[PDB]
């Protein structure tokens, strides 16, 4: 999940990218 | 504290600039 | 509840806020 | 969509819950 | 306070009315 | 870390969409 | 500071950085 | 009040101490 | 990426998330 | 300055960049 | 978690509304 | 820098005046 991912670590730009639909 | 719940915020803030019209899914779940 | 238009970023921390738990689905260019 | 009901026009703390999942 | 209670555990908008005038 | 200030910024936002006409008063202390 | 029109929740982020400790109060519709 | 004093119109740092506690 | 106006703190945040660890500079009366 | 070239006007991920160091 | 990284979120926020016309440097590093 | 001062203590809006240009 991104709640996992992105608050564990920080998520770039570019990584958070792959959370839009 | 409620550290997981913070960082939702900014989260789906920044899912807003990033996806724009594409648009996003936010499941807090999973 | 505030009662005035959400915009942008603004519309997307009132879902974030209001859904809680159950999470979002923000698609504006549907 | 969301947009045009709640930015542009005003929602409902009700109608604001239609989007949620 | 509300930030006692708020920031400990997460507080849910029904909670947070309770903060309202 | 600052973990208290950065929470009392999102709880105030909050209580603004929360709360709408009806106002708030935040009080840090107590 | 900013000199700008302050709304919705951007007056309450204001208020809460610039009262600090003092703590605010925000009463729109008086 | 205050979202007419800020909002609609221009206040200084000064003026928005006015609402602090 | 959103393809909308960005102003206020909303262009700062943009630059924060977009710029990451290059870090940027906000200088708007230049 | 930034503000007129993206708040004013609208500007593409590239030109925000543009204010990156 | 990601502390450093939402904080600077705040701080970006806050030097916009303290800096005003000044403007500011963010630079996370340093 | 200001992430280190300010994420470790919190620092008023006197405090954050030092790091504007
Ligand atoms: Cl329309
Ligand atoms: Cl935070
Ligand atoms: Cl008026
Ligand atoms: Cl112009
Ligand atoms: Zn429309
Ligand atoms: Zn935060
Ligand atoms: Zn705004
Ligand atoms: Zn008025
Ligand atoms: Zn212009």
């Known amino acids: ?21 | 504290f409620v550290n997981q719940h913070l960082c939702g915020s900014h989260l789906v803030e920044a899912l807003y600039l990033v996806c724009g019209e594409r648009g996003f899914f936010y499941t807090p779940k999973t």
């Not at chain 1, 999940?1 to 992105?6: A, D, K, L, N």
């Not at chain 1, 608050?7 to 570019?14: A, Q």
């Open chain 1, 1 to 21: 999940g991104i709640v996992h991912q992105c608050c564990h670590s920080i998520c770039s730009l570019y990584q958070l990218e792959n959370y839009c639909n």
